Design a protein around this ligand. Structure first.
Ligand SMILES: Nc1ncnc2c1ncn2[C@@H]1O[C@H](COP(=O)(O)OP(=O)(O)O)[C@@H](O)[C@H]1O
Ligand SMILES: Nc1ncnc2c1ncn2[C@@H]1O[C@H](COP(=O)(O)OP(=O)(O)O)[C@@H](O)[C@H]1O
Ligand SMILES: N[C@H](CCC(=O)N[C@@H](CS)C(=O)NCCC(=O)O)C(=O)O
Ligand SMILES: N[C@H](CCC(=O)N[C@@H](CS)C(=O)NCCC(=O)O)C(=O)O
Ligand SMILES: N[C@H](CCC(=O)N[C@@H](CS)C(=O)NCCC(=O)O)C(=O)O
Ligand SMILES: N[C@H](CCC(=O)N[C@@H](CS)C(=O)NCCC(=O)O)C(=O)O
Ligand SMILES: [Mg+2]
Ligand SMILES: [Mg+2]
Ligand SMILES: [Mg+2]
Ligand SMILES: [Mg+2]
Ligand SMILES: [Mg+2]
Lengths: 468, 470
């Protein structure tokens, strides 16, 4: 239980060596993104590159809680898939959301359409991430959110694991630390392997994988690495297109097959379409609908996408609704165990409790990708003064840890909290479940008191964990 | 040879795809250097990164000439070692140079010192690069220069092989091009292997490899990659120090063992000290002498360094001079075949001939590593003011056949018509009379606009490439 070496007390010249070695590792192993300060770095590969904002050395996370997260991965895969099949559940839970939130209404309209066409679909898959904080008071592993769409950092997470293991190999003796207590990580390989197996189930060897990307994508290297895996290891072609280009170059062939710029597609992997910002026009919504109407295997489908909304995570947490969707009683227990307080803005008991104690609460709109949440002051002010746009959640307060934060080649000391993202990969075919796996991790670390922790936004860093 | 697809005639859209793919590959695989426009990028790893200026698709090079270069690698390895053993030849050849060139004179003083000491060292190594152009009129592979010290681009050359192989696999069908005609390239792995095996010959498992580096090094990643290989694959520690840090933290232990900052060193690998710019003060000269006096295996030693001066390359080319150093008559013929016209400035048939026809000639001072030489107008002017000339040699200007290139530089591409220069690495390691490594070890290619005097890749004049065997 003796805590870990305090990372603010390392000799300055020892520390300068660790930092330099991290920067070098990062560069050799493409722990890199486009730098936000170099105008074309989110368009033109090869230019204006910078290492990922990172945490030099892992913070502690207990092995018991790591095991709880691991175990929950195939459980949440299953849950997501079971809730996605209840189209009525989704449409009803989101019924008032629909009127407060025009983005969610748009998502809903594509889903209603799919409902009203009722195709026999039986292959259909997930690449998801369940993200957790350990609340200090309670000492419990709690889910922050479920990410069912364009989950990031499978390669970043696995390259962080490489980095921490290489720094601990070299420097571990001086610190009380062993590389083998940073969990093994296969996330990027697992991600490509799910895409390959899905492509294999559709079973047309001349089809390709369509990757749907954003117009600016500083984190493009991670998507290029997955396509390089598909190509080199799995021998499967990828093509990358924005939703605009899919509207422009896309059609459904008479046999129901998606073709884009003349290339048949059997799998559509989304690295985009999770924000209203990806839908400047009707052009992008048409592309989205066009692909949903295809026999291409979507990752994810519109129903999966809806499952990942914060409004559904809230509904699921209501008394006996988990039990509509799971019958394994040991799983309901495990699930129930990682749920934090979650409430609709119609539970006005808890709205009172929140206006009164805004530091104790998070307020989340139906969005993905950070920015968006509301805390403390701005939360009371918003709550006083469209309620179906929000949920309310119990504020979680992990135990802080000393960190060295490396950001643009410079390091500082801070006191942080981390958030462990446990990837799940899932594939089935009929009744036949082909992949239902915990598939590695990522962890996001931020200054303990910062509201936002988005890495690419400048608020957070990537990390690993050191098992305790 | 069936001519290669003309790379200026590719459709705009196909071509934009190939460029985009090349930029993406370069990133994933650390074909990257610090960007000269970002002030910190030659000292702070991780920041201000940019892909290497590159040629998108390889130019033709005949397999016959590629074979010649290959062959000649263990030949030159042997030559350079045999010439380095003749301390008299080196000192005598450079005797006029000494007075014309303060940098060469300092190199000579260290070597003079090691001649007196006369310590007998049975373990010698080299990691070197012989660079060639095929002169068009006469279809002959001719050596531009011999590089015996801090030869760059073993990692860049192999990654360029990887890039062109990957672009040809995807796009070769559209172009009539096959990835297999880009030769296989193991140059960085061979580099690390020669360093590990030398470290093994010295045979002290707690000793490290000292890498001597420059204060600003935008091409640092290639050094980092070799030390990563040494650590991960060969389990050998490296430390990196500039010459001034070696003078500040280095000493010879009573047993003759170099120790730097408390760490015993059994191998010294130079990525620096081949330019006067690396010696701002007596610190760096003292560091250089300190290391030479040590028992550590130098890569290279002071004698190998001298061998690689353009004066010796010119001396070796003098009739019967080679014949002192090579016994094998088939090797003398091979060697003499790649020698271009080479002349001391004391030959004034050739000084007149050069002054009338300066475009036919290159003038080279005793430097390494870029942007040093003199051609056409500046050559006739410098040659006419010389009536200390010991600083220069004169060489036949070689004119390869040009090829269409796409040149990719900071994320933008342009057409140009280029020439290439094939650098064939050799690795060499002996212990007494036992030759442990004497190998052709991969390659690099430097390509430049046909008419540019300079073709330094990092200085912004040249691009890296491969060759397509035809
Ligand atoms: N219940 C909570 N307690 C503490 N912090 C939270 C909680 N919910 C969200 N956050 C903070 O907000 C970030 C963004 O919230 P999240 O629910 O994960 O939304 P998004 O889809 O935008 O990533 C989290 O990574 C965390 O730093
Ligand atoms: N004999 C020659 N004919 C044609 N160009 C040459 C010749 N010698 C040198 N050059 C050009 O000048 C560059 C620098 O010359 P080199 O002899 O290689 O010196 P350095 O040690 O500085 O690299 C070469 O790469 C080539 O582009
Ligand atoms: N444009 C898209 C970026 C997508 C994105 O940010 N996505 C969310 C779920 S949407 C995410 O899952 N993870 C990591 C973010 C952090 O911690 O800072 C891409 O590259 O994927
Ligand atoms: N080539 C990789 C390397 C080995 C690995 O286990 N993990 C990789 C991929 S996630 C990693 O992310 N980081 C370490 C990077 C390295 O040093 O090559 C593989 O075989 O998967
Ligand atoms: N500090 C050094 C740079 C050393 C260097 O340029 N060296 C010469 C022999 S000295 C060379 O062999 N090659 C290719 C150079 C170009 O075209 O930019 C490094 O080690 O990278
Ligand atoms: N293979 C992918 C692509 C990267 C690559 O080409 N690397 C080169 C640089 S040497 C390489 O070592 N090639 C084979 C080595 C040899 O033949 O000796 C990767 O490295 O992950
Ligand atoms: Mg989140
Ligand atoms: Mg999210
Ligand atoms: Mg040269
Ligand atoms: Mg030379
Ligand atoms: Mg040279």
């Amino acid at each position: 239980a003796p805590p870990l070496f305090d990372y603010h007390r390392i000799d300055q010249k020892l520390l300068q060596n660790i930092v330099y070695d991290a920067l070098v590792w990062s560069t050799l192993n493409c722990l890199l993104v486009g730098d936000k300060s170099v105008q074309r770095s989110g368009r033109v590969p090869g230019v204006g590159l910078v290492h990922l904002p990172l945490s030099l050395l892992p913070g502690p996370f207990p092995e018991s809680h790591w095991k709880q997260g691991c175990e929950l991965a195939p459980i949440f895969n299953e849950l997501v898939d079971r809730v996605s099949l209840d189209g009525k559940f989704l449409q009803e839970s989101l019924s008032r959301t629909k009127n407060a939130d025009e983005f969610t209404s748009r998502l809903l309209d594509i889903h209603s359409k799919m409902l009203q066409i009722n195709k026999k679909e039986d292959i259909r898959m997930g690449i998801v991430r369940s993200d957790y904080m350990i609340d200090e008071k309670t000492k419990s592993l709690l889910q922050i959110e479920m990410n069912t769409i364009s989950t990031s950092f499978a390669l970043i997470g696995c390259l962080m694991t490489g980095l921490h293991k290489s720094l601990l190999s070299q420097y571990g003796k001086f610190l009380g630390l062993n590389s083998n207590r940073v969990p093994a990580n296969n996330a990027v390989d697992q991600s490509a392997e799910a895409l390959a197996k899905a492509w294999s189930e559709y079973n047309n060897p001349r089809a390709a994988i369509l990757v749907v990307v954003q117009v600016e994508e500083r984190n493009m290297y991670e998507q290029h690495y997955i396509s390089a895996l598909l190509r080199e290891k799995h021998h499967i072609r990828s093509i990358r297109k924005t939703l605009t280009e899919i509207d422009q170059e896309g059609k459904i062939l008479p046999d129901g097959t998606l073709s884009v710029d003349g290339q048949a597609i059997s799998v559509v992997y989304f690295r985009a379409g999770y924000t209203p910002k990806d839908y400047p026009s009707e052009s992008e919504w048409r592309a989205r609908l066009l692909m949903e109407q295809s026999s291409a295997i979507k990752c994810p489908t519109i129903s999966y996408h809806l499952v990942g909304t914060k409004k559904i995570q809230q509904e699921l947490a209501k008394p006996g609704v988990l039990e509509r969707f799971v019958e394994n009683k040991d799983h309901i227990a495990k699930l129930r165990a990682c749920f934090a307080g979650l409430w609709s803005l119609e539970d006005s008991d808890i709205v009172k409790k929140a206006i009164e104690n805004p530091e104790l609460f998070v307020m989340k709109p139906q969005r993905e990708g950070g920015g968006n949440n509301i805390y403390g002051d701005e939360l009371r002010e918003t709550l006083l003064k469209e309620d179906a746009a929000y949920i309310l959640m119990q504020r979680i307060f992990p135990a802080t840890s000393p960190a060295i934060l490396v950001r643009d080649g410079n390091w500082d000391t801070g006191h942080v909290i981390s958030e462990a993202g446990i990837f799940g990969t899932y594939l089935r075919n009929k009744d036949k479940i082909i992949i239902n796996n915990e598939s590695g991790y990522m962890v996001r670390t931020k200054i303990s008191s910062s509201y936002e922790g988005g890495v690419l936004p400048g608020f957070g860093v990537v990390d690993t964990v050191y098992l305790t």
